[PDB]
Symmetry: D2
Subunit: 332 residues, 4 copies
C-alpha cells in the first residue's frame, strides 16, 4: 500500500525508516510545513538515537529520494489542502500530534486519502494494538488510532496475564525517556508545569492515560487499571512497571512460563521475553512493543505481583504503525 | 556526643557536613586510608551535588580543621587498629559500606569507641528509622544500623498509612539516583552485572531489601511489603512509588489530610508533605526522610492506591544518622 | 533605580534574584505573555539549577510579591504596549532574546521607560562589559547591551593579557552548557541545524560572535580575535579556552601573577583567579564574570599559550546586568 | 595472526569485535581476572554504547565461543603467568592500562607471546599511528604502542596540514567523552583529583600528552605542539580542536581541499572529511581515526586557524589496533 506521512517529527521519520527497512508499505508523500526538502534529507539521514540511515537520501527535482524512491513533499499548515490523492497516498499516517480527533484527522480524506492512522491516542477514533485487538478492525473504519507507545507496551502483557490468572485490579508506573515535549532548561509549559522543568536534570512525575486506555482495547479490563509516569534523563527506551492483583494464584515461575510461551506464539514479535541481566540500552532500536524482564519483577504472594516490561518508545511503536497498516491493507 | 567517622565518602562527608551545619554532634576524628589529609580538605570543600562548603576547611599540623575545630585523622585499613579513644571519639559512624555486620563493625570498640552506627542496612545489627522505631533503641545496644535511604523514605509513609487505614499488602518501586557503586561506562561489577552498565546511559533495574526491611521497623508490616529499584541518570534525589491495598476505605483526599497532619506533628522534619508541582531537583539538599507528593499519586478505588514520596538520598539520610546519634546520646 | 524585566526566563528570573540582593536596584514590573501570575510564583520559587528561592514569593491581589515588594505583572506580546511608566519602571531589562536591535528594544520607550538594557549582544546598540569599557557609558544612551555571557568571560581576561603582554592574535573556543534554544531530542531548528540535535546526547559545534565582539569593547583587539563554541550536556557553567600569541614574552608564572593581581585589585568580583583543582559544578551560582584556572592552562612557549577561564553563564551574567544598571544609575 | 587480549574492557572488547570483522586477525585467548567466563559472555554480547553484538557468543566447555571460534580464557593478575604460547597467541593486545612500559608489557613474552601491542601511549615503547609512521615498524620491535585515541585523531590531520603549509606551532584542546577511569559521583582519584568528580555532572579539565606525542610520530613537529583536554558528559565520541600557526598562507577553502584530497587518497579510512552539519552522535561506531569537520572550524587569517576533527575514541582506536596488527603481521 502507498502511504503518506503528515509530520516528519520523530514518529514520522521513524515510521518512514521502518517502512523502508521492512519493505512492507511504500512511502510516496510527506507533508511538513516547518521542514523543507533539504532539511528533511539531513533529519532523516542523521539520527542521534538510532544512527545514520543506510542507503541514499537526497533531494532531486523537489523530491526526497531514498534508495531511488522519490517521495512528493508538501508543506501545508492545513491537512485539508494536502494533495494526497494526486500523489497516490492511499493511507495517511497522522503524526503531528495535533490532529488526533476524528474531526481533525478526517481532514486528510478531503485531500483524497482513503484512510488515516493516527500515530497517537484519540478521544474518539477507535484504537488498535497489534496482538491484542487488531482483529476488531474492519473495512468501514477510515480513521483509526494505533494508541500510544505505553499502551502498546502494557496491553499485550496485561492480555497474557489476564487470560491466565485474571487481573482483579492493577496500578502502572512507566519510567519513560525524555520526549520532544520537554525543555532543556526550566522554561514555560503552561498547563503542565512539571514538564517545563529541565529535562536532563530531573525525575519528573507526569500523568498518563495509557493504563486506562488498555481497558478499551481489552474491554474486560475497563476500569480495572490506571497509572502514572516518571520522565527521566535518557534519550530513548522506557519501562512499564505493572503492580497487579490476580484472581487465580500464580507462582512467579508460572507467570514466566506463560509469558515466555506467549512470546514464542501468537504474540511473537510483539511481546518478548528475556531472563538476561538487561538495561534500557539493550532495547535501543528493538522492534518489540513490550519485552517482559523475568529477573527484574517481583512477587509478594501468589495473588500480588510486580511485573516489568521494556519498550523502545520510538522504534517499537513505529514498527507497529507499519504493521497496523499492513493488516488494514489485507482487509481491503 | 563526640563522633568519629570511618570512611570519608558521600555519606561520611555529608554526615560531617550535617554535623557542622546543625551543630548537633561534634566530629572529632576521621579515618580513611585512601584519602590523605590535603585531599580530604579538597573533597570536603568542593561538592558537585551540594555545592562548596559554607565555612572554612584547611589542613593544619596534621589535622583537618573545619570552622576552626581540629579533627584527628587516622589512615587505618583495619578498623580494629583505629585508636578512637586517643581522639576522644565516643560514637563511631561506620560509613565505608564494607563493615556492616556486627562482627565487622564491632572492631571499632577495640580502639575505644563506645557505640557504632552503621550507615547502611546490616544483616544482623538492630535497625532504627527515626520517627518510626527509634524509641525502641536502648542502652544495651552498642552496635546499630540506621537502615538505608530508601527504608527511611518508605517507613515513615508506611507508618502513617498503616496506622490510619491498614496496609493489607504493598509493592514498592524506588526510582533512584546514581550511586558510587555504579560505573561510568560498561565495566565489571562482580555478581551484580546490571550495576556495571554505563550509569548515565541507562535505566538499570536493581534489587533492594528496603521494602522488606520496613517489617523490621514496623513489625505489623512484616511479610506485607517488598519492592525493587530502578537506577537512572541523575546525581542525587530519589523517589518511592508505593502501590498498596488498604484495609479500610480511604478517599485520596483523606489520605492527603492524614499525611499532611503527620508532617505537621510528631513526624515534622522527617516526613514532608507538598501539593506543589515538584520535580527531583526541588529536593536537592532537602533534609527530610520522605516528602509526600500529593499531586503525583493516583487511586484506582478507595482500597488500591499509588503513593509517591521523594527523598534526598544523600543529605536526608546523613541528617538522620546525626539525629539517631542525638537520640542515642539522650539515653546514656 | 526602579526596574522592569521583559521576559521572565533564565536570565529574567536570575536578574530578579540578583536584584533582590542590592539596595540600588528594585524590580517593580515584569512582563511575560507565557507566564501568568500564579505560574511566575512557581517558576521563581523553584529552580533546578540554582535551587529554591530563599526569600518569600506569593501572588497577592494580582501582583507578584517577592520579599514583601509588590511587582506589577504585564502580559503583552508587543513591548510597545507595556505600560512601564505607570508601574514606575525607569530601566527595562530586555531579556526575551527577540528584541535585540535598537529599533525593537526601543519599543519600551513608548511605554514610559527611560532606558533599556538588552541582556544579549546587539547588532547596533552600544555594548558594555563591566570592568572593561563600562566607563564609556554616558547618560545620553537610552538603549544599551550587556553583551553575552561569553564576551563577559573573555573580555576581562583579554584585557589583562593585552594590557601586560599584548595579544597579537587569538582564537577562542567556549565549551558551553545547554540552553533554552536547544532541543531535548532531535528536532527542528530552522537554519541552525546542529542546534536541533538532542542536547543531552551530543557535543554540538556552534558559531559565536563573542570573541569578535571583544574587539568592540577593547578596540585595540579589533579584528584580532575570533572563535567558536561546543555545546555539551551540562545544565549550567561554561568555560573559555583562549589560545593566543603574545607580543612580549610571558612565562606562565608571570601570567598567573598578573591575573591574580588583577583579580585582587581593579577587577575584583569580575575576574577571579584560582589554583584549586576545580570542575564546572564548582562555579554553580558563582557571581564572577570570568575565573582564570591556573592549573588547567598550558603554554607552548613564551609567546604562545592556552588560557582557561570559567563562567557561570546564567548567574555571573545576571549579576553583571544588575551591576551595569547600578553604574548607569550613578551617572544619571 | 592469532591474537590474545589482556584486559577485556571497553578497548579489549571492541578490539575483539573489530577482530571478528577481519579475516586477518583471529582472537584465540583472553585474560581478565575480574571477568569470569560466563560474565564475559554477557559483557561481550551487550554493549550500551555500540549495541548488541551482531553474531553469536556462548560459553562451551570452558571456552568463550564467538561466531563459532573457541577462545581460551585465563584469569591471571600477573601477565608473566599467562600461557599465551600454549593457547597459540602470537600477538598480545595489552589493554589493561596498567602495563604500558616496555618492562611491564614485556611480561607477555615470558608466557610465549611473540609481540605485544600496547593499546595506550608508552613512556618508552615505540609509538605508531596508522597512516603517519606505521611504515617505520620492523620485525626487531617485539613491543610497540598504538599511542592514544587523541594522538590518532590529531596526527593524521597534523600530517596533512604540516606537509602542505607547515606548522610553526599549535595548541590542541580535546573535548573528550567520559571513560572508565572516571567516577559516577565525587569520589577518590588520588593522583588526579579533578578526575574523581562526578563525571556526568561536570566539565573536567585534564592533562594530556597526546599533542606532544604527535612529535614522536612526526619528528618534524617535535616541540611544536602541545595541549589539554576537557572530559564532558557524553558516553563516547570525542573531538580535537587544533589551533595552529602556518608557515605558508592558506585560505580556508584551500585547507578544505587538501584535507579532502588526503581523505580520498592515501589516508582513506583513517582521515575522513565532512561538510555536513554533524554532531558527536553522528560518529558513534565510526571507524575513522579523525574526521575533519569543515563547517566547524574557523580562520582568523591566512596564517592562524582553528581546525576541528571528530573521533570515536572507543571504536576508531580499536580498529586501528587491529589495523596495526595486520600491518605487523604483513611483515613477518
Ligand atoms: N550515597 C547514598 O545515597 C547512601 C544512602 C544511604 C546509605 N548509604 C550507605 O552509606 C555507605 C557509604 O556510601 P557512600 O555513598 O558514602 O559511598 P562512597 O563510596 O562515597 O564512600 C565510601 C568511603 O569509604 C572509604 N573507605 C573504603 N574502604 C575503607 C576502609 N577500610 N576504612 C576506611 N574508609 C574506607 C572510601 O575511601 C570512601 O571515601 C554505604 O554503606 C551505603 O549503602 C548511602
Ligand atoms: N542563559 C544564558 O546562559 C545566557 C547568558 C547570557 C545572555 N543570555 C541572553 O539572555 C536572553 C534570555 O535568555 P534565557 O536563557 O533567559 O532564555 P529563556 O528562553 O529562558 O527566557 C526567554 C523568556 O522570554 C519570554 N518571552 C518570549 N517572547 C516574549 C515576549 N514577546 N514578551 C515577553 N516575554 C517573552 C519567554 O516566555 C521566556 O520566559 C537571550 O537574549 C540570551 O542570549 C543568556
Ligand atoms: N576508552 C577509550 O576511549 C580509550 C581509547 C584509546 C586507548 N585507551 C586505553 O586502553 C586501555 C584500556 O582502556 P579501557 O577504556 O578499555 O579501560 P577499561 O577499564 O574498560 O578496561 C580495562 C580492563 O582491564 C581489566 N584488568 C584490570 N587489571 C587487569 C590485569 N592485571 N590483567 C588483566 N586484565 C585486567 C579490567 O577488568 C577491564 O576489563 C587504557 O590504557 C586506556 O588509556 C582507551
Amino acid at each position: 500500500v502507498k502511504v503518506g506521512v503528515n509530520g516528519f517529527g520523530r514518529i514520522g521519520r521513524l515510521v518512514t525508516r521502518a517502512a523502508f527497512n521492512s519493505g512492507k508499505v511504500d512511502i510516496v508523500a510527506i507533508n511538513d510545513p516547518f521542514i523543507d526538502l533539504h532539511y528533511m534529507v539531513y533529519m532523516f539521514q542523521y539520527d542521534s538515537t538510532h544512527g545514520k540511515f543506510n542507503g541514499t537520501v537526497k533531494a532531486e527535482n523537489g523530491k526526497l529520494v531514498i534508495n531511488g524512491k522519490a517521495i512528493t513533499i508538501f508543506q501545508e499548515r492545513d491537512p485539508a489542502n494536502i494533495k494526497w490523492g494526486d500523489a497516490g497516498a492511499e493511507y495517511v499516517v497522522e503524526s503531528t500530534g495535533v490532529f488526533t480527533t476524528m474531526e481533525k484527522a478526517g481532514a486528510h480524506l478531503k485531500g483524497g486519502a482513503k484512510r488515516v492512522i493516527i500515530s497517537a491516542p484519540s478521544a474518539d477514533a477507535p484504537m488498535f494494538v497489534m496482538g491484542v485487538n487488531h482483529e476488531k478492525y474492519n473495512n468501514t473504519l477510515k480513521i483509526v488510532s494505533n494508541a500510544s507507545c505505553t499502551t502498546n507496551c502494557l496491553a499485550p502483557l496485561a492480555k497474557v496475564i489476564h487470560d491466565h490468572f485474571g487481573i482483579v485490579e492493577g496500578l502502572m508506573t512507566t519510567v519513560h525517556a525524555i520526549t520532544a515535549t520537554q525543555k532543556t532548561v526550566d522554561g514555560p509549559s503552561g498547563k503542565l508545569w512539571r514538564d517545563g522543568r529541565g529535562a536532563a536534570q530531573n525525575i519528573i512525575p507526569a500523568s498518563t492515560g495509557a493504563a486506562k486506555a488498555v481497558g478499551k482495547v481489552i474491554p474486560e479490563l475497563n476500569g480495572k487499571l490506571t497509572g502514572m509516569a516518571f520522565r527521566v534523563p535518557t534519550p530513548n527506551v522506557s519501562v512499564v512497571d505493572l503492580t497487579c492483583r490476580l484472581e487465580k494464584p500464580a507462582k512467579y515461575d508460572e507467570i514466566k512460563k506463560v509469558v515466555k510461551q506467549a512470546s514464542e506464539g501468537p504474540l511473537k514479535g510483539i511481546l518478548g521475553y528475556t531472563e538476561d541481566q538487561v538495561v534500557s540500552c539493550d532495547f535501543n532500536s528493538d522492534t518489540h512493543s513490550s519485552t517482559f524482564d523475568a529477573g527484574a519483577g517481583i512477587a509478594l504472594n501468589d495473588h500480588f505481583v510486580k511485573l516489568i516490561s521494556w519498550y523502545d518508545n520510538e522504534f517499537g511503536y513505529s514498527n507497529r504503525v507499519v504493521d497496523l497498516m499492513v493488516h488494514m491493507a489485507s482487509k481491503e
